[PDB]
Amino acid sequence: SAVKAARYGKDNVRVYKVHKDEKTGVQTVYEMTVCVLLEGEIETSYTKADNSVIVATDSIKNTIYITAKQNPVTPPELFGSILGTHFIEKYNHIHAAHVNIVCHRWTRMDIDGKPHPHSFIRDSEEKRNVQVDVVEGKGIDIKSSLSGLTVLKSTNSQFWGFLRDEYTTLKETWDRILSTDVDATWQWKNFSGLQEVRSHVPKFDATWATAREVTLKTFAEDNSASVQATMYKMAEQILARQQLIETVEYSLPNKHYFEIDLSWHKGLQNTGKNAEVFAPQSDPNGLIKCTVGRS
Amino acid sequence: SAVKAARYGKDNVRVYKVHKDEKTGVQTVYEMTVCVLLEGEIETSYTKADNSVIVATDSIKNTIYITAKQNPVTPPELFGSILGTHFIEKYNHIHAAHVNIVCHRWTRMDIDGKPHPHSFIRDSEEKRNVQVDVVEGKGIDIKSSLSGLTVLKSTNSQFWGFLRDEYTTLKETWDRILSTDVDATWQWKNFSGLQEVRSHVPKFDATWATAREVTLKTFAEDNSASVQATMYKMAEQILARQQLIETVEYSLPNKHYFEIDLSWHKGLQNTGKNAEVFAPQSDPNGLIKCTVGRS
Amino acid sequence: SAVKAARYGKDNVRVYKVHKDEKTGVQTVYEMTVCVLLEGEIETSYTKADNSVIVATDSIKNTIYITAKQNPVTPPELFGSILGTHFIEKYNHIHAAHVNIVCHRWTRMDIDGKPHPHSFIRDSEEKRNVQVDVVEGKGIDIKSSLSGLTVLKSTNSQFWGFLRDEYTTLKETWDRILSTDVDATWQWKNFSGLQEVRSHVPKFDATWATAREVTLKTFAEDNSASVQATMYKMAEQILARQQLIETVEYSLPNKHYFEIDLSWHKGLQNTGKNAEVFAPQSDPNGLIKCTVGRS
Amino acid sequence: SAVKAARYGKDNVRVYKVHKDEKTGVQTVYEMTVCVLLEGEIETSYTKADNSVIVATDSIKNTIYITAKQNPVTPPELFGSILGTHFIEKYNHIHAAHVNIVCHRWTRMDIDGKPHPHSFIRDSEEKRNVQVDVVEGKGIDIKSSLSGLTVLKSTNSQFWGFLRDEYTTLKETWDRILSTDVDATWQWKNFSGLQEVRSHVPKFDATWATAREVTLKTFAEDNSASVQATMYKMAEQILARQQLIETVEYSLPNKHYFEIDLSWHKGLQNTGKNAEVFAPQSDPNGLIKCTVGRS
Ligand SMILES: O=c1[nH]c(=O)c2nn[nH]c2[nH]1
Ligand SMILES: O=c1[nH]c(=O)c2nn[nH]c2[nH]1
Ligand SMILES: O=c1[nH]c(=O)c2nn[nH]c2[nH]1
Ligand SMILES: O=c1[nH]c(=O)c2nn[nH]c2[nH]1
Ligand code: NA
Ligand code: NA
Ligand code: NA
Ligand code: NA
């Protein structure tokens, strides 16, 4: 037997950082969960019990805190690139670092119409994520994403004209509820190294904001022919607005809300045009994916 | 042996209702999870296998949907009171109904600064809840609550002057992070029945809004001497603003964020006045409760 | 306003303890999650920002570890009683301690038919719990429980003869699946103090074992007329076997498995006597409770 | 823009099947959660709103139930292969099916030392999984796995001789707790189609049993030099015992249990050789992966 692939490191490292403005007294907080996995010439730790090649995962944890102390943690694309680069440069035998960051929302509170200087609220479990792969001699690959964005529209979704055979019971519809949890990922063109990532720093927050805005607007305004057709419209627009993105991937559950026939009870009308009360279904769910690139 | 207490019913009944305005085209959605448990002269189902006294839990589920079809579902205090009253009036041998409702957020989307007519976003997992106990001959007891409201302040929290003995290692502090998930419950004076609940309908949404606003403002503005002292200030204000509340209960975790000493690494300064990077702790947590009433 | 009730302390304190037998080399591990909440003359911490009355929750955490170091941690009824008693005796102004312990399973591994001296497996998320309330001058109240015991029987459950009215759609059945997650609690007679708890130490593990065995056997062997009737049989037997128990409470979900009519597809027969494939329902669920005491 | 990749289908389809032995009266239950995603010539549903190419996800759900009705559901490798093959053969334009199955434990109850004919217990949240990829003209790729197997050993784990630099604070140790949740996957050689999968049916359950046994025995008996070294020993043995496996992948968290220094309290000794009480850490955790193949 032989080691075909190996990676190891520290997961679930929770980090908070506060920035305090000297002049204004305004404080800004960042909170993330970080995972760092390393690859390189480490096979002998597995095959020969040779720990001399292991950078302890506890040390990786220390490094994350030290790096956060000495560098900005925003945008997360930059922080992940700094962190991954550190490992490949510091350790001769480590040749790849894989950094995953989940950013948690701490939104500044408005009290009496004024933004508060040091108080924050978690408005939703929506996350902003990055995956940064730093590979020695191959540059820096970054995938940025948003996840946990849960939306619902109560009309202006349709689904008809699908294949019908002996396995089909679903009725065609011209008016249904559409609800989903949005997972959207945009993959950046490969960067040559940290200097190039630094050169594009303003584009990261701007592209996240664009991706979010395009997702919300398209969802709200499309008279949707299917999840497939609506998601494609979203991806098309993001690619058009940021030339440094190579691909956009969406993964969308279709969280079903079923009509409830109440006609057995005193002829009560609650289906089709009379539908007011629905039963949300926890499972099963549709799951629709697509990756869109440039032609 | 004897049955000392018994209750039974249906839990986790998910319900969605849409209201469609005829003139404006604006749609409004409500989504809740409902539990209904009944009590009454039902001992023989347990002791003698006599099912004749059982209103099937499946029928309770049907009743929830039918009731939602025929009545407003907002405010939840009213809907719960209608639902509980139904069971005690419909069935001679049922003498108490216990209705718990969790309301999920579907907040109307703003697209290009305009509120969208039929698109919604789940902004946070904060819930608005009610517990309604309808007891034949004893009226209607309602407890209203908000839960899952997660906040953090990065300064203006202190904790010093506590008891110090041979079990104590905690250092006094004049500047710490305070973060919590707010669970706040206000208990209404007993209502004589459904007519009286109807008479107070406008107070329910107003008091929820007040409780939320008082919680947020007090948290943000108090230079907190402890969780205990800040929570008491919140409860005091709610009681002052709504005379029909008898008690206010708060239950607050203290979600710790620990300083990280980095001085072992090149004398890096990250404690006290130099603290920038902290380690959020998943567990353990402080848990502080109090119930405040009128003197 | 006035403080009507207050309690505070530390939740989610994870504790592991190992016992090493000197002669045999056999090791035994215990892992628990502990919560301790205190009450007493502490109102002024809430109303006057007087921290002098607060035993810091961090100190409560230290005390749990110290107590576990110096005392057996099994049975949990004894450990909880020691822990609660400590607080009321050590601090003049603390008059009640409320201790909740969840015990996690670490079952010794069998390797090649022999029990291993120091290796363990988590066989299921079933827990053994205690709630111990130590109240100065009122002794020690203990509630013991098991929870998270998930079972299913595929036949020998019936449900017919229930009330049928205009809200009822459920069909009577003489053969259904019954599946539940068992939550069973037995409440001990009040103990005068720690000496009395010590005197009954062997009864705690024995009664837990009995409660578990009675639950499993009754579930498996009863030709169940309803969840109500089967649960009552369980409680009756536990009360008969342990005279120091005052009440037994069961709380049982009815986790539904629905038939799937496949007759639309080539007349395939999958209902009633031909039912083989079912759809487990995540929600809603029945919820049936009862408390049984001595007549 | 162009569709680069697309797949869609139904997730979280819960399925239960019962087998009833005619002669013996013994019943056996199976419960699984199934996901099926399809690929093929479906781009136009995304780009042109052409639903004619969509097999509705609701129909995929129906197909799963029908397939379970007409075929054995065990071993899951066979059921997944039947299910995936159905889609590529039935629909001309569907060219790949991806089937994921999670099998839930329902272990027959022993009552009074005898196996019960129709009563079952969920003994642990350990799962047995398969991933089956059926690709038209490329055969059937199967990855089998076990997950959620949680173990702990209280001694006979060491970790010393790792790299030490200015980022390192971890002390070397010759005696520590090792606890993990095992995720192990074995990848089968490609099969040409369903006939070949059928020919190997007995090997599937046998190899699962072997993988489980090797994991448990190696974990219990290895005087572990690191997670890396122990996991490699496991994988080596599985590959040696089943020639039809090409690779074995392990993914293991290192769930830390920290010593608690209690010496500040009356010189209490609880570290090194005197360590009895430990603090389990919820996060962060080490994460160690490796894929082992044939040389
Ligand atoms: O938008 C949808 N896409 C689909 O593929 C599908 N299948 N069933 N319902 C559906 N809705
Ligand atoms: O606000 C606090 N209240 C308390 O009771 C406490 N105990 N430790 N830290 C604390 N902080
Ligand atoms: O055992 C049962 N008890 C009940 O109260 C009930 N109601 N619906 N189905 C049921 N099954
Ligand atoms: O077994 C281990 N492997 C590692 O890579 C490691 N790093 N810190 N502790 C560790 N333990
Ligand atoms: Na390197
Ligand atoms: Na009544
Ligand atoms: Na006392
Ligand atoms: Na095909």
> Three-class SS string for chain C?
CEEEEEEEEEEEEEEEEEEECCCCCCEEEEEEEEEEEEEECCHHHHHCCCHHHCECHHHHHHHHHHHHHHCCCCCHHHHHHHHHHHHHHHCCCEEEEEEEEEEECCEEEEECCEEEEEEEECCCCCEEEEEEEEECCCEEEEEEEEEEEEEEECCCECECCCECCCCCCCCCECCCCEEEEEEEEEEECCECCHHHHHHCHHHHHHHHHHHHHHHHHHHHHCCECCHHHHHHHHHHHHHHHCCCEEEEEEEEEECCEEECCCCCCCCCCCCHHHCCEEEECCCCEEEEEEEEECC
Q: Which residue has the tokens 């290692």?
A: B169
CB D199 within 8 A of CB D140: no
Task: Residue A154: list chain B partners with CB under 8 A.
Answer: 18, 27, 29, 118-120
- Provide the token pair at B272: 């006290």
Give the residue carrying structure tokens 């001296």.
C117
Q: Is the peptide bond before D75 cis (omega within 30 degrees of 0)?
A: yes
Asked whether the beta carbons of D191 and D143 are under 8 A apart, the reply is no
Which tokens go with B223? 């230079």
Q: Is A218 helix (H, G, I), strand (E, B) or coil?
A: helix
Residue A195: what residue type?
Answer: Q
Taking an 8 Å cut-off on Cβ atoms, the answer to whether A13 and D283 are in contact is: yes
The answer to whether A228 touches D8, Cβ cutoff 8 Å, is yes
Question: In a 3-state reduction of DSSP, which class is residue D118?
Answer: strand
Residue pair B229/C45 in contact (Cβ under 8 Å)? The answer is: yes
How many Cα atoms are found within 13 Å in the side-chain-facing hemisphere of A18?
30
Residues contacting residue A247 through CB under 8 Å, at least 6 positions apart: A186, A187, A291, A292, A293, D4
Whether D230 is a known active-site residue: answer: no
**Residue D130 half-sphere exposure, CB side, CA atoms within 13 Å?**
30
**Helix B227-241 × helix B201-221 angle, to 10°:** 150
Solving technique = X-ray
- Look up tokens 């990749």; give the residue: D5
- Residue A126 half-sphere exposure, CB side, CA atoms within 13 Å? 21
- Separation of alpha carbons C224 and C178, rounded Å: 9
Q: Across the interface, which of D8, D231, D291 has its CB nearest the CB of A228?
A: D8
Own/partner pairs, D198-207, CB within 8 angstroms, 24+ separation:
D198/D78, D200/D244, D201/D75, D201/D78, D203/D242, D203/D244, D204/D75, D204/D76, D204/D77, D204/D78, D204/D144, D205/D74, D205/D75, D207/D144, D207/D238, D207/D241, D207/D242, D207/D244, D207/D245
Quote the ligand 7 centre to C96 CA distance (angstroms). Answer: 7
DSSP β-bridge partners for residue D30: D17
Q: What is the C-alpha to C-alpha distance for residues C223 and A17, in angstroms, rounded to an integer? A: 61
Residue D58 structure tokens: 């609701």
The minimum CA-CA distance between A263 and chain D, rounded to whole Å, is: 24
In terms of CA atoms, which chain C residue is nearest residue B290?
C6
> Using an 8 Å Cβ cutoff, are A130 and A77 in contact?
yes
What Rg value do the Cα atoms of chain C yield, rounded?
A: 24
Q: Do D280 and C14 touch (CB under 8 A)?
A: yes
Residues with CB under 5 A from ligand 5 (ion): A 88, 94
Cβ of A106 below 6 Å from ligand 4: no
- β-bridge partners, C149: C182
C283 lines ligand 2 (CB under 6 A): no
Chains touching B (at least 3 CB pairs under 8 A) are: A, C, D
What is the Cα A123 distance to its own chain's centre?
16
Q: Which residue of B has its CA nearest to A25?
A: B155
Classified as helix, coil or strand, D154 is coil
Catalogue the long-range contacts made by C105-113 (C-beta closer than 8 Å, 24 or more residues apart). Answer: C106/C29, C106/C30, C106/C31, C106/D152, C108/C28, C109/D151, C109/D216, C109/D220, C111/D216, C111/D217, C111/D220, C111/D221, C112/D217
* Cα–Cα distance, C12 to A291 (Å, whole number): 43
User: A276, B17: Cβ pair inside 8 Å?
Assistant: yes
Q: Which residues, in sequence order, are CB contacts of B284 under 8 Å at separation 6+?
A: C10, C11, C12, C13, C14, C61
| Shortest-distance ligand to the CA of residue A54 | 4
> Catalytic residue positions of B?
10, 57, 256
Do residue C163 and residue B55 have CB atoms under 8 angstroms apart?
yes
> Cβ-count burial of A23 within 10 angstroms (0-12 exposed, 13-18 middle, 19+ buried)?
exposed
Ligand 1 lined by A68 (C-beta under 6 Å): no
D266: left (phi over 0), alpha (psi -120 to 50) or beta: left
Cβ contacts of D206 within 8 Å, gap of 6 or more = none
Name residues whose C-beta falls within 8 Å of residue C174's C-beta, 6 or more positions apart in sequence. C158, C160
Residue A129's φ and ψ, nearest 5 degrees, are: -125, 155
Report the alpha-carbon distance of residue C152 to residue C280 in Å, rounded: 12
Asked if B112 and B105 touch (Cβ cutoff 8 Å), the reply is no
Contacts of B100 (CB under 8 A, 6+ apart): B34, B35, B36, B80, B129, B130, B131, B132
Specify whether the backbone of B267 is left (phi greater than 0), alpha (psi in -120 to 50) or beta.
left
How many Å apart are CA B83 and CA D71, to the nearest integer?
A: 46
By the 8 A CB rule, do A94 and A40 touch?
yes
Give residue for tokens 């300083």. Answer: B259
Alpha-carbon span D182 to D190, nearest angstrom? 25
- Output the CA torsion sign for A230, D50, A252, B31: positive
Q: Return the number of other C-beta atoms located less than 10 Å from residue C96's C-beta.
A: 17
Distances (CA, A) of B19 to A33, A151, B198, B238, D14: 40, 18, 20, 31, 32
- D282: nearest Cα among C15, C214, A5, B151: C15
Contacts of B10 (CB under 8 A, 6+ apart): B35, B36, B57, B58, B60, B61, B64, C284, C285, C286, C287
- CA-CA distances (angstroms) from residue A180 to A148, A235, A254, B242, D217? 9, 16, 5, 39, 44
- Spatial distance between the Cα atoms of C248 and B4, rounded to a whole number of angstroms: 10
* A173 is known as an active-site residue: no
Contact criterion met (CB < 8 Å) for A277 and B65: yes
Neighbour count for residue C266 (Cβ, 10 Å) = 8
Q: Contact at 8 Å (CB) between B235 and B294?
A: no
The whole-angstrom distance between residue D279's C-alpha and the CA centroid of its chain comes to 29
- A7: enclosing H helix or E strand: strand A2-20
Beta bridge partners of D108: D120
Cβ–Cβ < 8 Å for C260, D65: yes
Residues in binding site of D for urate: 57-58, 159, 176, 227-228, 254
Q: Is D57 in the pocket of ligand 1 (CB under 6 A)?
A: yes
- Superfamily grouping for domain A1-295: Urate Oxidase; (3.10.270.10)
Q: By three-state DSSP, how is residue D117 classified?
A: strand
Q: Atom of ligand 4 at shortest distance to CA of D288?
A: 5
Cβ atoms within 10 Å of B257's Cβ, excluding its own: 21
Angle at D84 between CA D79 and CA D87, to 5 degrees: 130
Cα Dmax for chain D: 78
Q: Which of B250, B252, B242, B136 is nearest to B192 (CA)?
A: B136
A268, with CB counted inside 10 A (0-12, 13-18, 19+), is middle
**Distance, CA of A37 to CA of A35 (rounded, Å):** 7
d(CA A157, CA A230): 10
Rounded Cα–Cα distance for residues A168 and A171 (Å): 9
3-class secondary structure, B59: helix
Please give the Cα distance from B255 to B177 (Å, whole number).
9
Copy the structure tokens of residue C34. Answer: 């502990």
> Residue A125 and residue C7: Cα distance in Å, rounded?
30
A193 lines ligand 1 (CB under 6 A): no
* DSSP character at residue D83: H
> Which token pair is A228?
């497939």
This structure's resolution (angstroms)?
Answer: 1.6
Which of C59, C89, C166, C178 would best serve as a mutation to test chain B binding (most B beta carbons within 10 A)? C59
C254 is in an annotated binding site: yes
CA dist D114 → B128, C211, C220, D109, D117 (Å): 50, 19, 12, 8, 9
Judge if the beta carbon of residue D172 lies within 6 A of ligand 4. no
Exposed/middle/buried for B217, CB within 10 Å: 0-12, 13-18, 19+?
A: middle
HSE, side-chain direction, 13 A CA sphere, residue D203: 17
DSSP readout, A16-64?
Answer: EEEEE-TTT--EEEEEEEEEEEEEES-HHHHHS--GGG-B-HHHHHHHH
Q: How far apart are the C-alpha atoms of A170 and A172, rounded to whole Å?
A: 7
CA of B83 to the centre of ligand 6 (A): 13
Angle formed by the axes of helices D57-70 and D76-90, to 10°? 130
| Residue of D278, D281, D283, D285 to mutate, testing the C interface (most C Cβ within 10 Å of its Cβ) | D278
Residue C159 Cβ inside 6 Å of ligand 3? The answer reads yes
Q: Write out the two tokens for B217.
A: 């403002």
Q: How many CB atoms lie within 10 A of CB D33?
A: 19
Instruction: Compute the distance between CA of residue C237 and CA of residue D279 in angstroms, rounded to an integer.
Output: 39
For residue C277, how far is its CA from the centre of ligand 1 (angstroms)?
Answer: 24
Query: Which residues are close to ligand 8, an ion, with C-beta < 5 A?
Result: D 88, 94
Contact D182, D213 (CB under 8 A): no
Going B108 to B111 to B117 to B118, the CA torsion angle's sign is negative
Q: Do B178 and B227 contact (CB within 8 A), yes or no?
A: yes
**CA atoms of B288 and B182, how far apart (whole Å):** 11
Strand partners, A110: A115
CA-to-CA distance for C135 and C188, rounded, in angstroms? 15
Q: What is the maximal distance between C-alpha atoms in chain A? A: 78
Nearest beta carbon to residue D282 from set B167, B264, B282: B282
Q: How many Å separate Cα D119 from the centre of its chain?
A: 25
Q: Assign D82 to helix, strand or coil.
A: helix
- Say which of B15, B149, B268 has its CB closest to residue A69: B268
Are residues A65 and B260, on separate chains, in Cβ contact within 8 Å? yes
CB A252 within 8 A of CB A268: no
Does the beta carbon of C49 lie inside 6 Å of ligand 2? no
Interface test with D, best of C152, C176, C179, C264 (most D CBs within 10 A): C152
Q: Are B281 and B258 in contact (CB under 8 A)?
A: yes
> Among C100, C144, C103, C109, which Cα is nearest to C126's?
C103
For residues D191 and D132, give the distance between their C-alpha atoms in angstroms, rounded to a whole number: 11
Provide the 10 A C-beta neighbour count for residue C25. Answer: 10
Phi/psi at D66 (5° precision): -60, -45
Residue numbering of the annotated binding site of B for urate:
57-58, 159, 176, 227-228, 254
| B11, B46, B50, B54, best to mutate for ligand 3 pocket (most atoms within 8 Å of CB) | B54
CB atoms within 10 A of CB A201: 14
Query: Is residue B182 packed enough to be buried (19+ CB in 10 Å), middle (13-18) or exposed (0-12)?
Result: buried
Cα A162 to chain centroid, rounded = 31
Report how far apart, in Å, the C-alpha atoms of C94 and of each of A246, C88, C134, C162 are.
65, 5, 11, 51
- Number of Cβ atoms within 10 Å of the Cβ of B176: 21
Angle of helix A201-221 versus helix A76-90 axis, rounded to 10: 140
* Residue A205 CB neighbour total at 10 angstroms: 14
The verdict on a CB contact (< 8 Å) between C160 and B35 is no
